[PDB]
Coordinates of C-alpha atoms and ligand atoms in Angstrom, one line a residue:
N1 CA -24.5 70.3 169.1
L2 CA -28.1 69.3 168.6
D3 CA -28.2 65.8 170.3
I4 CA -27.1 67.5 173.7
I5 CA -29.5 70.6 173.4
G6 CA -32.4 69.1 171.3
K7 CA -34.3 67.6 174.3
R8 CA -34.2 71.0 176.2
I9 CA -35.4 72.6 172.9
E10 CA -38.1 70.0 172.0
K11 CA -39.5 70.3 175.6
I12 CA -39.8 74.2 175.3
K13 CA -41.2 73.8 171.7
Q14 CA -44.0 71.5 172.9
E15 CA -45.1 73.7 175.9
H16 CA -45.6 76.5 173.3
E17 CA -46.9 74.3 170.3
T18 CA -49.6 76.9 169.7
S19 CA -46.9 79.6 169.0
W20 CA -43.7 77.9 167.4
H21 CA -42.2 79.7 164.3
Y22 CA -38.7 79.8 162.6
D23 CA -38.6 83.6 162.2
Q24 CA -36.5 84.7 159.1
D25 CA -35.7 88.3 160.4
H26 CA -33.8 86.9 163.5
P27 CA -30.8 89.2 164.5
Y28 CA -28.5 86.3 165.6
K29 CA -25.3 85.6 163.6
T30 CA -22.9 84.2 166.3
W31 CA -25.8 82.5 168.3
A32 CA -27.6 79.5 166.7
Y33 CA -31.4 80.4 166.5
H34 CA -33.9 77.5 166.8
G35 CA -37.4 79.2 167.0
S36 CA -39.8 81.5 168.8
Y37 CA -43.2 81.8 170.8
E38 CA -45.5 84.5 172.2
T39 CA -44.8 86.4 175.6
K40 CA -45.2 90.0 176.9
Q41 CA -43.4 91.5 180.0
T42 CA -40.9 94.2 181.3
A43 CA -37.5 96.3 187.1
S44 CA -36.1 99.9 187.5
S45 CA -34.0 101.4 190.4
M46 CA -36.0 103.5 193.1
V47 CA -34.7 106.3 195.4
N48 CA -34.2 105.6 199.1
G49 CA -35.8 108.7 200.7
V50 CA -34.1 108.2 204.1
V51 CA -30.6 108.5 202.6
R52 CA -31.6 111.3 200.1
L53 CA -33.2 113.5 202.8
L54 CA -29.9 113.3 204.9
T55 CA -27.7 114.0 201.9
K56 CA -29.4 117.3 200.6
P57 CA -26.2 119.0 199.3
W58 CA -25.9 116.1 196.7
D59 CA -29.4 116.8 195.3
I60 CA -27.7 119.3 192.8
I61 CA -24.6 117.1 191.9
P62 CA -25.4 115.5 188.5
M63 CA -22.9 112.6 189.0
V64 CA -25.1 111.6 192.1
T65 CA -28.6 112.5 190.7
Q66 CA -28.0 110.8 187.2
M67 CA -27.1 107.3 188.8
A68 CA -30.8 106.9 189.8
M69 CA -32.4 107.4 186.3
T70 CA -33.1 104.7 183.5
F71 CA -23.4 95.8 175.2
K72 CA -25.9 93.1 174.0
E73 CA -24.2 93.8 170.6
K74 CA -21.0 92.5 172.3
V75 CA -22.7 89.2 173.5
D76 CA -23.4 88.6 169.7
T77 CA -19.5 88.6 169.0
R78 CA -17.2 85.5 168.4
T79 CA -13.6 84.8 169.8
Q80 CA -11.2 82.7 167.6
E81 CA -9.7 79.3 168.6
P82 CA -6.2 80.2 169.9
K83 CA -3.0 78.9 168.1
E84 CA -1.8 75.4 169.2
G85 CA 1.1 76.9 171.3
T86 CA -1.4 79.0 173.3
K87 CA -3.7 75.9 173.8
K88 CA -0.6 73.9 175.1
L89 CA 0.5 76.8 177.5
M90 CA -3.2 77.0 178.8
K91 CA -3.6 73.2 179.2
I92 CA -0.3 72.8 181.1
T93 CA -0.9 75.9 183.4
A94 CA -4.5 74.8 184.1
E95 CA -3.3 71.3 185.0
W96 CA -0.6 72.7 187.3
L97 CA -3.0 75.3 188.9
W98 CA -5.8 72.9 189.8
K99 CA -3.1 70.6 191.5
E100 CA -1.9 73.6 193.5
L101 CA -5.4 74.7 194.5
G102 CA -6.4 71.1 195.4
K103 CA -3.2 70.4 197.5
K104 CA -4.9 71.3 200.8
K105 CA -8.6 71.0 199.6
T106 CA -11.0 68.1 199.1
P107 CA -13.7 68.6 196.4
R108 CA -17.1 67.6 197.8
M109 CA -20.8 67.9 196.9
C110 CA -22.8 70.7 198.6
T111 CA -26.2 69.6 200.2
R112 CA -30.0 70.4 199.9
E113 CA -29.5 71.5 203.6
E114 CA -26.7 74.1 202.8
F115 CA -28.8 75.3 199.8
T116 CA -32.0 75.7 201.9
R117 CA -30.1 77.8 204.6
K118 CA -28.7 79.9 201.7
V119 CA -32.2 80.8 200.3
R120 CA -33.7 81.2 203.8
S121 CA -31.2 84.1 204.5
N122 CA -31.3 85.9 201.0
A123 CA -28.1 85.3 199.0
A124 CA -28.7 86.4 195.3
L125 CA -28.8 82.9 193.6
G126 CA -30.3 84.2 190.3
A127 CA -33.2 81.7 190.2
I128 CA -36.8 82.4 188.7
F129 CA -40.2 82.6 190.6
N130 CA -43.6 79.0 187.3
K131 CA -45.3 76.9 190.1
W132 CA -44.1 78.5 193.4
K133 CA -43.9 82.3 194.3
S134 CA -40.3 82.9 195.7
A135 CA -37.3 80.5 196.2
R136 CA -38.2 80.4 199.9
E137 CA -41.4 78.4 199.0
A138 CA -40.1 75.7 196.6
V139 CA -37.3 74.6 199.1
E140 CA -39.8 73.4 201.8
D141 CA -42.1 71.6 199.1
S142 CA -41.0 67.9 198.6
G143 CA -42.3 68.1 195.0
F144 CA -39.6 70.5 193.9
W145 CA -36.9 68.0 195.0
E146 CA -38.6 65.2 193.0
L147 CA -38.2 67.5 189.9
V148 CA -34.5 68.0 191.0
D149 CA -34.1 64.2 191.3
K150 CA -35.6 63.5 187.8
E151 CA -33.1 66.1 186.3
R152 CA -30.3 64.8 188.6
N153 CA -30.8 61.2 187.4
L154 CA -31.1 62.6 183.8
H155 CA -27.6 64.3 184.3
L156 CA -26.1 60.9 185.5
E157 CA -27.7 59.4 182.3
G158 CA -25.7 62.1 180.4
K159 CA -28.8 64.1 179.2
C160 CA -30.5 67.4 180.2
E161 CA -34.1 68.7 180.0
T162 CA -34.8 71.8 182.2
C163 CA -31.4 73.6 182.5
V164 CA -32.1 76.7 180.3
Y165 CA -30.7 80.2 180.6
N166 CA -32.9 83.4 180.6
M167 CA -31.1 86.6 179.4
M168 CA -31.4 90.1 181.0
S169 CA -21.4 95.9 180.2
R170 CA -23.7 93.5 182.2
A171 CA -26.0 90.5 181.2
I172 CA -27.4 88.2 184.0
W173 CA -28.5 84.6 182.9
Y174 CA -31.1 83.3 185.4
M175 CA -32.0 79.5 185.6
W176 CA -34.9 77.9 187.5
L177 CA -34.0 77.3 191.2
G178 CA -33.7 73.5 190.5
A179 CA -30.9 73.9 187.9
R180 CA -29.2 76.5 190.3
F181 CA -29.3 73.7 193.0
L182 CA -27.6 71.1 190.7
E183 CA -24.9 73.7 189.7
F184 CA -24.4 74.4 193.5
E185 CA -24.3 70.7 194.4
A186 CA -21.5 70.1 191.8
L187 CA -19.3 73.3 192.0
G188 CA -20.5 75.2 195.2
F189 CA -17.4 73.7 197.0
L190 CA -15.2 76.3 195.1
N191 CA -16.9 79.2 196.9
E192 CA -18.1 77.4 200.1
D193 CA -14.6 76.0 200.9
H194 CA -12.7 79.2 199.9
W195 CA -10.6 77.6 197.0
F196 CA -9.6 81.2 196.0
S197 CA -8.8 82.4 199.5
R198 CA -5.4 84.2 199.6
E199 CA -3.9 81.5 202.0
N200 CA -4.9 78.7 199.5
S201 CA -4.5 80.3 196.0
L202 CA -1.8 83.0 196.8
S203 CA -3.3 85.3 194.0
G204 CA -6.9 85.2 195.2
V205 CA -8.7 87.5 197.6
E206 CA -12.1 85.6 198.0
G207 CA -13.6 86.6 201.4
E208 CA -10.7 89.1 202.2
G209 CA -12.9 92.2 202.6
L210 CA -12.5 95.8 201.5
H211 CA -10.5 96.5 204.8
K212 CA -7.8 93.9 203.8
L213 CA -7.4 94.5 199.9
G214 CA -5.4 97.7 200.6
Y215 CA -2.9 95.8 202.9
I216 CA -2.7 93.0 200.2
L217 CA -1.8 95.5 197.4
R218 CA 0.8 97.0 199.7
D219 CA 2.3 93.5 200.5
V220 CA 2.6 92.9 196.7
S221 CA 4.3 96.3 196.3
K222 CA 7.1 95.2 198.8
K223 CA 8.3 92.5 196.3
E224 CA 11.2 93.4 194.1
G225 CA 10.0 93.9 190.5
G226 CA 8.6 96.3 187.9
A227 CA 5.5 98.6 187.8
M228 CA 2.1 97.4 189.1
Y229 CA -0.1 96.5 186.0
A230 CA -3.9 96.6 186.3
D231 CA -5.3 96.0 182.7
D232 CA -9.1 95.5 182.5
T233 CA -10.3 93.0 179.8
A234 CA -13.0 94.2 177.3
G235 CA -16.2 92.2 178.2
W236 CA -14.4 89.3 179.9
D237 CA -17.5 86.9 180.1
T238 CA -17.9 87.3 176.2
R239 CA -14.2 86.4 175.7
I240 CA -14.2 83.0 177.5
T241 CA -13.3 80.5 174.7
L242 CA -14.4 76.8 174.6
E243 CA -10.7 76.1 175.4
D244 CA -11.1 78.1 178.7
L245 CA -14.3 76.0 179.5
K246 CA -12.3 72.7 178.8
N247 CA -9.4 73.9 181.1
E248 CA -11.9 74.8 183.9
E249 CA -13.6 71.3 183.6
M250 CA -10.1 69.8 184.6
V251 CA -11.2 70.4 188.3
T252 CA -13.3 67.2 187.7
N253 CA -9.9 65.2 187.5
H254 CA -9.7 65.9 191.4
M255 CA -13.2 64.4 192.0
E256 CA -14.8 61.0 192.3
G257 CA -18.0 58.9 192.4
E258 CA -21.4 60.7 192.0
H259 CA -19.6 64.1 192.4
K260 CA -17.2 63.6 189.4
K261 CA -20.2 62.5 187.2
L262 CA -22.5 65.5 188.4
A263 CA -19.6 68.1 188.0
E264 CA -18.8 66.7 184.5
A265 CA -22.5 66.9 183.6
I266 CA -22.8 70.6 184.6
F267 CA -19.6 71.4 182.5
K268 CA -20.7 69.2 179.4
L269 CA -24.4 70.1 179.4
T270 CA -24.9 73.6 180.8
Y271 CA -21.5 75.4 180.4
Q272 CA -19.9 73.8 177.1
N273 CA -23.5 73.7 175.5
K274 CA -25.9 76.5 176.5
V275 CA -29.7 77.0 175.8
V276 CA -31.0 80.5 176.4
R277 CA -34.4 82.2 176.0
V278 CA -34.3 85.9 175.1
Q279 CA -37.2 88.5 174.8
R280 CA -37.4 90.5 171.5
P281 CA -39.8 93.5 171.1
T282 CA -40.4 92.7 167.3
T283 CA -42.4 90.7 172.3
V284 CA -41.4 87.0 171.4
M285 CA -39.1 84.5 173.2
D286 CA -36.1 83.4 171.0
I287 CA -34.6 80.0 171.8
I288 CA -30.9 80.5 170.8
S289 CA -27.8 78.3 171.7
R290 CA -24.0 78.5 171.7
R291 CA -20.9 76.5 173.0
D292 CA -18.6 79.3 174.3
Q293 CA -18.7 82.5 176.5
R294 CA -19.5 82.6 180.2
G295 CA -23.0 81.7 181.7
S296 CA -23.0 80.1 185.1
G297 CA -24.1 81.2 188.6
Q298 CA -22.8 84.7 189.5
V299 CA -20.8 82.8 192.3
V300 CA -19.3 79.8 190.3
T301 CA -18.7 82.4 187.5
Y302 CA -16.6 84.4 190.1
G303 CA -14.4 81.3 190.9
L304 CA -13.9 80.2 187.3
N305 CA -13.1 83.8 186.2
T306 CA -10.5 84.0 189.0
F307 CA -9.1 80.6 188.0
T308 CA -8.8 81.4 184.2
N309 CA -7.6 85.0 185.0
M310 CA -4.9 83.6 187.3
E311 CA -4.0 81.2 184.4
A312 CA -3.8 84.0 181.7
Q313 CA -1.6 86.3 184.0
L314 CA 0.9 83.5 184.8
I315 CA 1.2 82.8 181.0
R316 CA 1.7 86.6 180.4
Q317 CA 4.4 86.6 183.1
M318 CA 6.0 83.6 181.3
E319 CA 6.0 85.6 178.0
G320 CA 7.5 88.6 179.9
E321 CA 10.3 86.4 181.2
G322 CA 11.0 84.7 177.8
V323 CA 10.0 81.2 179.0
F324 CA 8.6 80.7 175.5
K325 CA 9.4 82.4 172.1
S326 CA 6.3 81.9 169.9
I327 CA 2.6 81.0 170.6
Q328 CA 2.2 79.4 167.0
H329 CA 3.9 76.1 168.2
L330 CA 5.5 75.0 171.6
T331 CA 8.7 73.0 171.1
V332 CA 9.2 69.8 173.4
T333 CA 12.1 71.7 175.3
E334 CA 9.7 74.8 175.6
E335 CA 7.1 72.5 177.3
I336 CA 9.6 71.2 179.8
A337 CA 10.8 74.9 180.3
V338 CA 7.2 76.1 181.1
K339 CA 6.7 73.0 183.4
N340 CA 10.0 73.8 185.2
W341 CA 9.1 77.5 185.5
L342 CA 5.8 76.5 187.2
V343 CA 7.6 74.0 189.5
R344 CA 10.5 76.3 190.4
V345 CA 8.8 79.8 190.8
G346 CA 5.0 79.4 190.0
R347 CA 3.9 79.9 193.6
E348 CA 6.2 83.0 193.9
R349 CA 4.7 84.4 190.7
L350 CA 1.1 83.8 192.1
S351 CA 2.0 85.8 195.2
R352 CA 2.9 88.7 192.8
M353 CA -0.8 89.1 191.9
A354 CA -4.2 90.1 193.5
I355 CA -7.0 88.6 191.4
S356 CA -10.8 89.0 191.9
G357 CA -12.7 87.4 189.0
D358 CA -12.0 89.4 185.8
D359 CA -10.2 92.0 187.9
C360 CA -6.3 91.9 188.5
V361 CA -3.2 93.7 189.7
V362 CA 0.2 92.1 188.7
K363 CA 3.6 93.2 189.8
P364 CA 5.8 91.2 187.4
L365 CA 9.6 90.5 187.8
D366 CA 10.2 93.6 185.5
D367 CA 8.5 95.9 182.9
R368 CA 9.1 93.5 179.9
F369 CA 5.6 92.2 180.9
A370 CA 4.2 95.7 179.7
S371 CA 4.7 94.6 176.0
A372 CA 4.3 90.8 176.4
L373 CA 0.9 90.8 174.5
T374 CA 0.9 87.8 172.0
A375 CA -0.4 85.1 174.4
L376 CA -2.8 87.5 176.2
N377 CA -4.4 88.7 172.9
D378 CA -4.4 85.2 171.4
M379 CA -6.2 83.7 174.5
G380 CA -8.8 86.5 173.6
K381 CA -8.3 88.5 176.9
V382 CA -8.0 91.7 174.9
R383 CA -7.3 94.8 177.1
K384 CA -10.0 97.6 177.3
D385 CA -9.4 101.2 176.0
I386 CA -5.8 100.7 174.6
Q387 CA -4.6 99.7 171.0
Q388 CA -4.2 95.9 170.9
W389 CA -0.4 96.0 170.3
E390 CA 0.3 99.2 172.4
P391 CA 2.2 98.5 175.6
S392 CA 0.5 98.5 179.1
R393 CA 1.1 101.7 181.2
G394 CA 2.0 100.4 184.7
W395 CA 1.6 102.3 188.0
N396 CA 4.6 103.4 190.1
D397 CA 2.6 103.8 193.3
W398 CA 0.4 101.1 195.0
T399 CA -2.0 103.9 196.3
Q400 CA -3.0 104.8 192.7
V401 CA -3.6 101.2 191.4
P402 CA -7.3 100.7 190.8
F403 CA -8.7 97.3 192.2
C404 CA -12.3 96.2 192.8
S405 CA -13.6 99.7 192.0
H406 CA -11.3 101.2 194.8
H407 CA -8.0 102.8 195.5
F408 CA -6.2 102.5 198.8
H409 CA -4.7 105.4 201.0
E410 CA -2.0 104.9 203.7
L411 CA -3.3 106.8 206.8
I412 CA -1.3 107.2 210.0
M413 CA -3.3 107.4 213.4
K414 CA -2.3 110.1 216.0
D415 CA -0.6 107.1 217.9
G416 CA 1.6 106.1 214.8
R417 CA -0.3 102.9 213.9
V418 CA -1.0 102.5 210.2
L419 CA -4.4 102.1 208.5
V420 CA -4.7 101.1 204.8
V421 CA -8.2 102.2 204.0
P422 CA -10.3 101.7 200.9
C423 CA -11.6 104.7 198.8
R424 CA -13.4 105.7 195.6
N425 CA -15.1 108.9 194.2
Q426 CA -17.6 110.1 196.9
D427 CA -20.2 110.8 194.2
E428 CA -20.2 107.0 193.5
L429 CA -20.7 106.1 197.2
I430 CA -23.5 108.6 197.9
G431 CA -25.3 107.8 194.5
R432 CA -25.3 104.0 195.3
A433 CA -26.7 104.6 198.9
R434 CA -29.6 106.7 197.3
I435 CA -30.7 103.6 195.2
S436 CA -32.9 100.7 196.3
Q437 CA -33.4 97.5 194.3
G438 CA -37.1 96.4 194.2
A439 CA -40.7 97.5 194.8
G440 CA -43.1 97.2 197.9
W441 CA -40.5 98.5 200.4
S442 CA -42.1 99.8 203.7
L443 CA -40.7 103.0 205.4
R444 CA -39.1 100.7 208.0
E445 CA -37.3 98.6 205.3
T446 CA -36.1 101.7 203.4
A447 CA -34.7 103.1 206.8
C448 CA -33.0 99.7 207.5
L449 CA -31.3 99.7 204.0
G450 CA -30.2 103.3 204.8
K451 CA -28.7 102.1 208.1
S452 CA -26.8 99.2 206.2
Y453 CA -25.1 101.9 204.0
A454 CA -24.3 104.3 207.0
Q455 CA -22.7 101.4 209.0
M456 CA -20.6 100.4 205.9
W457 CA -19.5 104.1 205.5
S458 CA -18.5 104.2 209.3
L459 CA -16.6 100.9 208.9
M460 CA -14.8 101.3 205.5
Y461 CA -15.1 105.1 204.7
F462 CA -14.7 106.7 208.2
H463 CA -11.8 108.8 206.8
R464 CA -14.1 110.8 204.4
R465 CA -15.5 113.7 206.4
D466 CA -18.9 113.8 204.5
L467 CA -19.5 110.0 204.9
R468 CA -18.7 110.0 208.7
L469 CA -21.1 112.9 209.3
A470 CA -23.8 111.4 206.9
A471 CA -23.5 107.9 208.6
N472 CA -23.9 109.5 212.1
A473 CA -26.9 111.4 210.8
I474 CA -28.6 108.3 209.2
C475 CA -27.8 106.1 212.4
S476 CA -29.3 109.0 214.5
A477 CA -32.5 109.2 212.2
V478 CA -33.2 105.4 212.2
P479 CA -34.4 103.8 215.4
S480 CA -31.4 102.5 217.5
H481 CA -32.6 98.9 217.7
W482 CA -33.9 98.5 214.0
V483 CA -31.7 95.9 212.1
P484 CA -29.8 96.7 208.9
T485 CA -31.1 94.8 205.7
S486 CA -29.9 94.4 202.1
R487 CA -31.7 92.4 199.2
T488 CA -28.4 90.9 197.6
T489 CA -26.0 90.2 200.6
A490 CA -16.8 90.1 200.7
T491 CA -17.0 90.2 204.5
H492 CA -20.1 92.4 205.6
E493 CA -19.3 93.2 209.3
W494 CA -21.6 96.4 209.1
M495 CA -24.6 93.9 209.0
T496 CA -25.1 94.0 212.9
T497 CA -26.8 96.0 215.7
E498 CA -23.5 96.0 217.7
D499 CA -21.9 99.4 218.6
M500 CA -20.0 100.5 215.5
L501 CA -16.9 101.6 217.5
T502 CA -16.7 98.0 218.9
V503 CA -16.9 96.6 215.3
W504 CA -14.2 99.2 214.1
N505 CA -11.9 98.0 216.9
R506 CA -12.4 94.2 216.0
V507 CA -11.9 94.8 212.2
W508 CA -9.1 97.5 212.2
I509 CA -7.2 96.5 215.4
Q510 CA -8.0 93.1 217.0
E511 CA -8.4 90.9 213.8
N512 CA -6.0 93.0 211.6
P513 CA -2.9 90.9 210.9
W514 CA -0.9 94.0 209.8
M515 CA -1.4 95.8 213.3
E516 CA 1.2 94.6 215.9
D517 CA -0.1 96.8 218.8
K518 CA -3.7 95.7 219.8
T519 CA -4.5 98.8 222.0
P520 CA -8.3 99.4 221.5
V521 CA -9.4 102.8 220.3
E522 CA -11.7 104.4 223.0
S523 CA -13.7 107.0 220.9
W524 CA -14.2 108.0 217.2
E525 CA -11.9 111.2 217.6
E526 CA -8.9 108.8 217.9
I527 CA -9.8 107.6 214.3
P528 CA -8.2 109.8 211.6
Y529 CA -9.5 111.4 208.3
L530 CA -7.7 111.8 205.0
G531 CA -5.9 115.2 204.6
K532 CA -8.5 117.9 203.7
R533 CA -7.1 118.3 200.2
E534 CA -6.9 114.5 199.7
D535 CA -10.7 114.4 200.8
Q536 CA -11.6 117.1 198.1
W537 CA -9.6 115.3 195.4
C538 CA -11.7 112.1 196.2
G539 CA -15.0 114.1 195.8
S540 CA -15.6 115.8 199.3
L541 CA -17.9 118.9 199.3
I542 CA -15.9 120.2 202.4
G543 CA -15.3 123.9 201.8
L544 CA -18.6 124.5 199.9
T545 CA -21.4 126.7 201.3
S546 CA -24.1 124.0 200.7
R547 CA -22.1 121.5 202.8
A548 CA -21.4 123.9 205.7
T549 CA -25.2 124.7 205.9
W550 CA -26.0 120.9 205.8
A551 CA -23.3 120.2 208.5
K552 CA -24.4 123.2 210.7
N553 CA -28.2 122.4 210.6
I554 CA -27.9 118.5 210.5
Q555 CA -30.1 118.0 213.7
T556 CA -33.0 119.6 211.7
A557 CA -32.5 117.0 208.9
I558 CA -32.3 114.1 211.5
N559 CA -35.6 115.5 213.1
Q560 CA -37.4 115.6 209.6
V561 CA -36.8 111.8 209.1
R562 CA -37.6 111.0 212.8
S563 CA -41.0 112.8 212.3
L564 CA -41.8 110.8 209.2
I565 CA -40.9 107.4 210.8
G566 CA -42.6 108.3 214.1
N567 CA -42.4 108.0 217.9
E568 CA -39.6 105.3 218.3
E569 CA -36.4 104.9 220.4
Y570 CA -33.7 107.0 218.7
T571 CA -29.9 107.6 219.6
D572 CA -28.1 110.9 218.9
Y573 CA -24.6 109.9 217.4
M574 CA -23.6 113.4 216.3
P575 CA -21.7 114.1 219.6
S576 CA -19.3 111.2 218.5
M577 CA -17.8 114.0 216.3
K578 CA -15.7 116.9 217.8
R579 CA -17.6 119.9 216.3
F580 CA -21.0 118.5 217.6
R581 CA -19.4 117.5 221.0
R582 CA -20.8 120.9 222.2
Ligands
LIG601 ZN1 -30.1 69.7 183.2
LIG602 ZN1 -9.4 108.4 197.7

């Protein structure tokens, strides 16, 4: 409590000494409330015209058009301390899982240099603008790093001054770039050295890519066992207990020297004790604090979510297999039984899951898992849109399992070779491509964002007839040599000016471990589509009059965009498709 946070508070209080007030109509119950001061400010989504002009049939689909217009009463909730038996299961599993993850990995500090290259090539690090404009500026200024060093030495001293969260089913807690650096220094290794790669963690998929997830779900399916379960948790970040944060901090037991001390500091001082500033239109800045829930960098968050989720799902598999009887109290024999489970079969049970942060697919030993709910509910990982004690409905077919907002089709090429391709509702794909994040975009930048989406569609979604044609139209309407961009950069192999058929061959054939025959594909017509009815089920406008007119007259849509952009060097990609090939 207040000895660890007070300094952070007293510093904010003093810089707004002409405003401080302990407001009495403060809405916080679950958050500790310390005071307020005067502010007045707010970034809305804009339409990408290049994409919208080349997807005219979708101008009248409400699912598309609505995406472009525009619970914080769930962040003010409170999870209960689990039973002692749950806490024992979680401590033992956490200990065993960090050992497994750390067997072929060395924890290590990340560097000012690594961090500098990160900012200088636009990764979303969720920092704030103040004393410098962008993050790009502060990184080259030696004064910044002096501020970092002050705080850094403070952290080694066991205190904190400037590591304060700014609030904004999503809620994004920004810190000043300096505190983001110190978080990255201590915990960046988890991401940077692929601790949750599938090879290293068995359950994880970090850096796998949308073209591998399908093959991974299919490999899980090949194991003997029950249905595939894919239960979403209701507001996962808000359900992270103090006990979860303490089990995550056990990664520091694998560390040493400066590192161990810095990592420990981040966990003690930013994670297990938070200070947050929130806007309130009643517009004042409220300085509230709490011990529990998730609030890290989007990227460390990803890794710790994956870690804790892996942990919960192993424990739920234990409950399914009757490794323990009650969560109220774990007997001494029930400890050794859990320990012996983890030693004997824990790696086999990890290979039964695909886990991406708060998202999971589990194929347990059998369907007893479906109603194994006591540990899962008592850890506070309460399932979304299902009664708390109602059993999980599993999937019989790996091609229906939802994972990372996708489903996966099995698709056989005219030469017999098998593609496992990602898919989702086409209204979702087209509606996202039509949105741009930020203001002050030139025509050229807007066109280059359009091209990023088109090249993604050609790489991941080539099997959808509307997306292949729209992607060819966008890549025909944007100058051939202009480089794809994106303002918050999975594997992203569409971010290139290389020939897209050459990237397709590298990703789907050459580098694809599930493809035994490495015969390159020579043109786009070798590359198959979903069945026509499958395509319509997944949202295709194939068969509609609007779409046939769009398809027939596409060269006129391409020319409209060409005319707006101007006299540049353009390539016609529409002859890559049979119907436009004369
Ligand atoms: Zn700090
Ligand atoms: Zn589909």
